[PDB]
Amino acid sequence: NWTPEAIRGLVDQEKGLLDPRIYADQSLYELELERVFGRSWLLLGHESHVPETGDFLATYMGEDPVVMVRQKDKSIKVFLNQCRHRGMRICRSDAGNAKAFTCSYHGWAYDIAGKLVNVPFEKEAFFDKAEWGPLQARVATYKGLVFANWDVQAPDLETYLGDARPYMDVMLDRTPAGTVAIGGMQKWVIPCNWKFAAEQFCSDMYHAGTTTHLSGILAGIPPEMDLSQAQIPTKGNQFRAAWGGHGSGWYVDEPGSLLAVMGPKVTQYWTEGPAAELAEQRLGHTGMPVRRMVGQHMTIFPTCSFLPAMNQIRVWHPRGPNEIEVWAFTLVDADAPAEIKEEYRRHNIRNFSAGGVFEQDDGENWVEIQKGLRGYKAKSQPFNAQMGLGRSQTGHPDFPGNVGYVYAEEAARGMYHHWMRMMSEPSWATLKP
């Protein structure tokens, strides 16, 4: 029994207080499934995961198991992986290509679209099949990326994404052919609330540029080169969305941390090259110098995060207030050279896999935070999110949006604000931009 008055008293973007009960309390999460994950746009993957007709990918929308499957008409339809007779999972494999779908319990047959087509012994034992198939979701695509939403009256992806759109095209729209996904989907389980993961890739450069990834950068630099040249970055800019809570952070000018993460060959394709300068003309009108963007993180609300400079994509599946699954793949430009695509594959394994020199440290951080939140006095006093307060201009002469300093938490205060709105406001009549 959480009322709007009480929910509003958990997040204060004006001061910078965060009530810890949001990561722990069972009831707030059970409301999150309804109020957030039941009506937000969620990343299901990339178009190239389902290139041909019949191709499918068993993924998740919050805790709802969902089937993303390409159609005859080159469109993508998404539905609940639940047979509506007695709840049985219809598509039972991670990914593949089927002509149809059949329940293994009583044998209800479905076509590729999720339409119910045959129920065994129908004229003998029976009702209308037309309104008894799995619940379809809204399906939208933003140049490769496939998103889905349950709510019929929620804004279309384009609107929901808002003023952040150009920032997404940094990783996505770089060529006429677009990007493609490398095969394989990395899946592992971290015992912590999803909000830590979303917030990190939103505004948390402050962890990478201090202590969390001191060993991560130690792995990248040459055996001779210790933490002396690795030059520790200092400059960078942080974006906050006008509406949505979407955020992004990137280092500016200083190419220190990127050379360690992705190596020499990748950085040439990103900073100084035929394709690197192509983006500065394809996205020149977006008011952004892409050649200066070196090392970047970005979170799309609620559970979408991606590092444009390293091309890592991940979806944080919530698994109770105390746990999350982590699904991740990587993207590459469809027409890029093979040896740039190979260095993208190897390094994204090296740094950002389950056993990656970077992700190892993030998990162990989040493991301890969640564990501490079992105690009473650990949920008594508010967390500090006052970093960079009153230091974001809405008209920065280098990047569009609410921009300030890189080690700030305005993008973080934005994420918790939209969250607070989506939890306290029941109707889209008030919530829409």
């Binding site: 490398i182 389980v189 015992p191 056993g355 440290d361 493991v367």
Partner: protein
């Protein structure tokens, strides 16, 4: 990855003992956190491979493992491995400081010769018990497919190639900061 093609005639007792004992010593170095010493066993042309493993219908049974052109848990070489060594031995490597308490139980060692002298195709099953911090316990089971060469070191051998086939689709643990 199919059933390991074992030789009709099993490897000699002396040989079977040497390679078993090698793996036992190998497990000793890792379980007692002697990393710099374990790394010396890896040859220049090392390939440390742990592919992803997905749920497939029998019909798509061949499409279970991620190929050499897809993402994986591990796909490392001599350089990248030394990076991980410099991370694990570091005071600022939080994921392993406080360090873990791992245990490599090694069995099912099957030995097979090749065309190249003093080079062997070794198959072995394992269970890895990782105990972390206060309460954290992660159990791994998979198999190792190695290419080992005879070397002039304390253990008798060196590792040329290694493939780990973990019996896991979704990794239940939060990380893989350990070595297999």
């Amino acid at each position: 990855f199919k059933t390991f093609e074992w030789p009709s005639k099993a490897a000699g007792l002396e040989l079977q003992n040497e390679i078993e004992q090698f793996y036992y010593r190998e497990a000793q170095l890792l379980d007692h956190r002697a990393y710099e010493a374990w790394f010396a066993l890896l040859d220049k042309d090392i390939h440390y491979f742990m592919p992803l493993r997905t749920n497939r219908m029998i019909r798509e049974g061949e499409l279970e493992y991620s190929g050499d052109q897809d993402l994986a848990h591990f796909d490392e070489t001599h350089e990248t491995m030394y990076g991980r060594i410099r991370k694990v031995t570091s005071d600022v490597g939080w994921a392993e400081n406080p360090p873990s308490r791992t245990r490599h139980l090694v069995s099912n060692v099957i030995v097979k010769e090749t065309a190249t002298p003093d080079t062997f195709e070794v198959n072995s099953a394992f269970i890895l018990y990782r105990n972390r911090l206060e309460r954290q316990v992660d159990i791994f089971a998979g198999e190792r497919r190695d290419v080992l060469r005879r070397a002039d070191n304390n253990l008798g051998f060196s590792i040329a190639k290694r493939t780990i086939l973990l019996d896991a689709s979704t990794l239940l643990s939060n990380n893989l900061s350990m070595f297999f």
